[PDB]
């Protein structure tokens, strides 16, 4: 008896998918029940067929603020990756020369 509110959005400009690598556009259709056993069954079918249920949304916006701190951390991680790919290209050239 789907009878709870829908929070829907469309995400375009996707990225490569976690489990297939597909650069496929997404769209979230969110309906949540406060039943606990219902939540467990929904988690079972959603994980088994198709879902990504990592987060724990909540009323405190402090979660979003810590998430902004996480996004700055995330930026630092990408510049780490950039350095490392530069280094591996250069060492591969060095080995190839001889």
């Amino acid at each position: 008896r789907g009878n709870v509110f829908l929070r829907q959005a469309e995400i375009e400009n996707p990225l490569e998918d976690p489990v297939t690598g597909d650069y496929v556009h997404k769209s979230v259709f969110i309906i949540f029940f406060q039943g606990d056993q219902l939540k467990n069954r929904v988690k079972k079918i959603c994980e088994g067929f198709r879902a990504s249920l990592y987060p724990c949304p909540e009323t405190p916006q402090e979660r979003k603020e810590m998430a902004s701190g996480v996004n700055t951390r995330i930026d630092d991680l990408q510049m780490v990756l950039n350095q490392t790919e530069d280094h591996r290209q250069r060492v591969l050239q060095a080995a190839a020369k001889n």
Binding site: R73, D76, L77, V80, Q83, T84, H87
Partner: protein, 141 residues
């Protein structure tokens, strides 16, 4: 690996393997190693890479409120000689491999950003050992 019909040479070889192994085991310690940490000149005592050092006595590096890690953090902040930086960063990496809570503590120290800034040292080897420390912190991060 080679085989000799002279038992003298093989006997001397075996005796040397034995005695030098005992000496290698003698090098394995944590009080002498920590005095070497405190001296401010990090000689390359071979325990820096010993697997028995990072499994049997890794928790020793967590002294009073992570005392010795804090000392090494201070000496990382103060001194920027290539080899002290290498020794300390590598030892911190080998410790923090086994202790995720040790990782969160090191993050609380602020030394993670000190290493992230050591990533811009003039010598590229120092930048690389800071890189290795960061990819020891990247796990679940």
């Amino acid at each position: 690996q080679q085989k000799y019909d002279d038992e003298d040479i093989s006997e001397d070889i075996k005796f040397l393997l034995e005695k030098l192994g005992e000496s290698v085991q003698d090098l394995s310690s944590f009080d002498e190693y920590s005095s070497e940490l405190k001296s401010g000149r990090l000689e390359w005592s071979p325990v820096h890479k010993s697997e028995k050092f990072w499994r049997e006595n890794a928790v020793r590096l967590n002294e009073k409120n992570y005392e010795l890690l804090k000392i090494l953090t201070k000496l990382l902040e103060v001194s920027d000689d290539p080899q002290v930086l290498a020794v300390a960063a590598h030892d911190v990496g080998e410790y923090v491999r086994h202790y995720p809570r040790g990782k969160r503590v090191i993050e609380q120290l602020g030394g993670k950003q000190l290493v992230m800034n050591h990533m811009h040292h003039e010598d590229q080897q120092v930048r690389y050992n800071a890189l290795l420390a960061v990819q020891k912190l990247m796990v679940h991060n």
